[PDB]
Amino acid sequence: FNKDQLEEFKEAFELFDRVGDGKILYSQCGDVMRALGQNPTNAEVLKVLGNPKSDELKSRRVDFETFLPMLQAVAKYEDYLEGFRVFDGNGKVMGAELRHVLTTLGEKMTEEEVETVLAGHEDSNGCINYEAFLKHILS
Amino acid sequence: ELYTKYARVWIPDPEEVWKSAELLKDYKPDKVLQLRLEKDLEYCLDPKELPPLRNPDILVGENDLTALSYLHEPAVLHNLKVRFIDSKLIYTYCGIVLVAINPYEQLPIYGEDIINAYSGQNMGDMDPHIFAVAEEAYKQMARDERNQSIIVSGESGAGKTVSAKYAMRYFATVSGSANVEEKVLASNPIMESIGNAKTTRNDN
Amino acid sequence: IGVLDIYGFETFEINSFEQFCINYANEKLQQQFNMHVFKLEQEEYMKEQIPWTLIDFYDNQPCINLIEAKMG
Amino acid sequence: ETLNATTPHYVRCIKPNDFKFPFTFDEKRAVQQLRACGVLETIRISAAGFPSRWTYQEFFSRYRVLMKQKDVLSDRKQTCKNVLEKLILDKDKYQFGKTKIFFRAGQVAYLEKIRADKLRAACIRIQKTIRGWLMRKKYMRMRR
Ligand SMILES: Nc1ncnc2c1ncn2[C@@H]1O[C@H](COP(=O)(O)OP(=O)(O)NP(=O)(O)O)[C@@H](O)[C@H]1O
Ligand SMILES: [Mg+2]
């Protein structure tokens, strides 16, 4: 990353700073990485964060300089398509089924996140074009 | 191997013959298992046995115990315990055998509408019930003149007489009628008087 | 069609001639069961055209010959 | 002689508790009676052999997720014969019947395990992608 990227990232970082001390929480580090185009797992985020404890995750604040090595480390379609075809073979996916699997398996997300990403993507049958949804969420 | 972290195993327990435990650290060949209980335990792996692995939950509760992938005492006892306590089903196939658990309670399942529902249906079609054995015997007798038997085994008080009673009630209903079933049930008091005894474990 | 009500296998802290006869009757019934189930499995393996050799019989005949043979 | 003349059907009755409480169950009573009724030895004798049996139709319906789209034929039976030999190493561990697949005891739970672990990995990867998009949208808001 060059100076310009670091400056834009620091500015965004400060925009996510809700206390004015130039810092974010550990729990925001992943959010910033994802906000910058990365798609790390929560496990990967905790690993680059150093597997923080609950207390520091909820109250310890870190500035851009400590976040930066983690962003660097994280930085350093057909598989995604087959992954979606797991839940298919008419090129569709049930909205109920995608909602169920995203809210009930793996590292379960909230219903509101799933509603937000799925809003406008299911048709009248309750089918999602997964190639279009995948391209959209990867753009 | 099959014994990974977040596997589940049955471990022996004094007060219920087996209890569930989750394998809290994956096993490698040797003497240790870190186990977690619904708390925290370590269990000696000793001559040798691995603890009996646990079936995936899609299999648990199915109508036929041989549908289970791991077949062993605690998985069988668990499937019967869940079907009986949670479902309040009292009948379960094991292979050819029908297992029947005494509820000590009356149940609606012996109604003549259900008698009709079972008639003409093969064992695959419907959830197990004593009528599903009676109907099989009846149609085996129809196919081929060979006589058919029904054999009922268990410690006294397990309900063998009531099972026979509903078995012949099935025949009386499906054939129609000649007041056999009344006479047969009226004979039971004398055969129980001349033929039954108190025993150390069990009366009648 | 015939219905047989019979006692099952029996074990107490003390076991005696009654329990010995009951357990021998139950060994006989369990043999006839195992051999019927084995017959039905050989039929189902014919139905699916699978070689018979894969299924082995489990035979309690040595305990019956222990109880009822001459010099039993 | 009376029974061997005849074709039997078996019922086993078990008595879940001594005190006749309605719909209560006692594991230490029942293990005794399942032992005395020979249910447990019947099950032990079935655990050797091929206790678990699957129709090719229902097997394929259940485990399409394991199959790569390269190797899904429109003939299910040959697809299954191709796939199971990849998924399970030992041909001894299963037999291809005419209409049904026969498994030894372990194998169906192993297939359920590998299915669940694959589906977990796919779920996690997709949901991290979704979370990443939603944080990128929230970053666009944070600039705006
Ligand atoms: N399927 C069933 N539905 C309802 N009650 C049942 C059932 N099976 C058994 N019972 C009850 O179990 C108790 C004893 O059953 P029963 O068939 O009379 O056994 P029994 O008289 O002790 N014959 P035995 O077991 O040889 O001593 C009674 O309270 C029955 O109501
Ligand atoms: Mg009674």
Residue numbers in the entry:
A (entry chain E): 4 to 79, 86 to 97, 100 to 150
B (entry chain D): 5 to 33, 35 to 43, 46 to 54, 57 to 186, 190 to 216
C (entry chain D): 433 to 504
D (entry chain D): 649 to 792
Paper passage:
By using the actin cytoskeleton as tracks, myosin also powers cellular cargo transport processes and can serve as a molecular anchor and force sensor. The active site of myosin is located at the interface of the U50 domain and the N-terminal domain and is allosterically coupled to both the actin-binding interface and the lever arm. This coupling ultimately enables the amplification of small rearrangements at the active site to large, force-producing conformational changes of the lever arm.
We determined the structure of F-actin-myosin-V in complex with the non-hydrolyzable ATP analog AppNHp with the aim to characterize a potentially short-lived, weakly bound state of myosin. Note that the two AppNHp data sets (4°C and 25°C) were combined to increase the overall resolution. By applying a mask including only the central three actin and two myosin molecules (central 3er/2er), the refinement was subsequently focused on the central section of the filament (central 3er/2er maps, resolutions stated). The resulting cryo-EM density map shows strong density for AppNHp, indicating high to complete saturation. Interestingly, the density also suggests the presence of two ions, both likely corresponding to Mg2+, given the size of the density and the buffer composition. In particular, myosin is strongly bound to F-actin and adopts a post-powerstroke lever arm orientation. The characteristic weak coordination of AppNHp in the PRT state allows myosin to remain strongly bound to F-actin until a strong coordination of the nucleotide is established. A comparison of the three states of the actomyosin-V complex (strong-ADP, rigor, and PRT state) reveals a striking similarity of the actomyosin interface.
